[PDB]
Design a protein around this ligand. Structure first.
Ligand code: ADP
Ligand code: MG
Length: 350
């Protein structure tokens, strides 16, 4: 069912995304390397898991690799490749593969990334294609001690020399992903190499309404039209929040209490991420709150914060806002800043 908090892993469990799935297939057909891009909670992991459900591939969670030590080593990455494709006999049974993988017998300490990728390409040769997906690949900048350059080199090698191997990199922090890859810097191993781009956006109004409608239909619940309209006006096409709301409504039976609880859950998660930002600079959260309150132009932001205590120099303010954009907290459009996720804005206004 739609209104369920467990991870979605199959195509029949994903509402719409039929254009996005086709565009992902098309990108794989056209380029060795594909970027899957969009706001956090928009549905990238879910789409990717459903896509790999039918197509031989592995998904590596780069954020989960970074989380523990704030750093990723070769051994850890390799151990994760090993465990994600295991038990390999299950894989061979599902996709009917006769080939065995040597690197699975070997200790991560004594394997190279290139060795592993060559074996996966050999597997691709039998199948047609093998997919390696890095979820939130911008965290690979915390790999090694050279800013993850060994991964860029590995990707350049796959691009040029492993034709039965396709790589998907996803990122919620889109600008930060583009920064890591550096495809226009001559120093980058990926220089001049073109990647496909598949963009995952929030549902439109009518799709959001239909999403909620389907969710309630599945449990024979009829929810008045105006309550679904009101939920979409507050929750604006973000499937992550639409599912939390659907769950809370099934549990609570009331628009007010379901939305109150949805906002509680959102507040908790967003506050956790705002903690992370606040450590880097308290300024980030100050700027975010200002924008959420309607101080959404340069001078509006600058005067507001000066008045609340902190005068931010113009070069600093520019850098801070640019970073916020690259992290995708914020969009700048028509000479105006906005919080990328309207629920984040709701939480920042308290
Ligand atoms: N197309 C969809 N259909 C149904 N539920 C979805 C869809 N996309 C996302 N979800 C729900 O929203 C949550 C957030 O999606 P996720 O794929 O984790 O976002 P992202 O990877 O973009 O941060 C998922 O756990 C699932 O609850
Ligand atoms: Mg994700």
């Amino acid at each position: 069912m739609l209104f369920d908090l467990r991870p979605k892993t199959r195509r029949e469990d994903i509402f719409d995304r039929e254009e996005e799935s086709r565009k992902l297939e098309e990108s794989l057909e056209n380029y060795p390397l594909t970027l899957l891009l969009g706001i956090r909670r928009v549905g990238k992991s879910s789409l990717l898991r459903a896509f790999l459900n039918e197509r031989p591939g592995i998904l590596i969670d780069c954020r989960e690799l970074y989380a523990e030590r704030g750093h990723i080593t070769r051994e850890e990455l390799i151990k994760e490749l090993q465990s994600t494709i295991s038990p390999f006999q299950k894989f061979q049974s599902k996709f009917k593969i006769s080939l065995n993988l040597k690197f699975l017998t070997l200790e991560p300490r004594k394997l190279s990334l290139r060795e592993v990728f060559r074996e996966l390409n050999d597997l691709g040769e039998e199948l047609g294609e093998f997919i390696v997906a890095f979820d939130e690949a911008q965290y690979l900048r915390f790999y090694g001690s050279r800013g993850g350059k060994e991964l860029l080199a590995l990707f350049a090698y796959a691009y040029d020399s492993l034709p039965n191997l396709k790589i998907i990199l996803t990122g919620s922090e889109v600008g930060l992903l583009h920064d890591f890859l550096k495809i226009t810097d001559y120093e980058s191993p990926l220089y001049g190499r073109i990647a496909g781009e598949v963009l995952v956006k929030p549902f439109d109004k009518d799709t959001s309404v239909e999403f909620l409608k389907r969710g309630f239909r599945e449990v024979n619940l009829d929810v008045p039209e105006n309550e679904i309209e009101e939920a979409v006006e507050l929750l604006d096409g973000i499937p992550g929040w639409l599912v939390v709301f659907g769950v809370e409504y099934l549990r609570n039976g009331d628009f007010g209490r379901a939305m109150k609880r949805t906002l509680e859950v959102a507040k908790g998660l967003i506050m956790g991420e705002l903690e992370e930002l606040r450590r880097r600079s308290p300024r980030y959260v100050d700027i975010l709150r200002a924008i959420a309150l309607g101080y959404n132009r340069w001078s509006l932001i600058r005067d507001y914060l000066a008045v609340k205590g902190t005068k931010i120099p113009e070069p600093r303010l520019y850098a801070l806002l640019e970073n916020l954009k690259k992290m995708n907290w914020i969009v700048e459009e028509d000479n105006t800043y906005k919080i990328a996720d309207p629920v984040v804005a709701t939480v920042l206004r308290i």
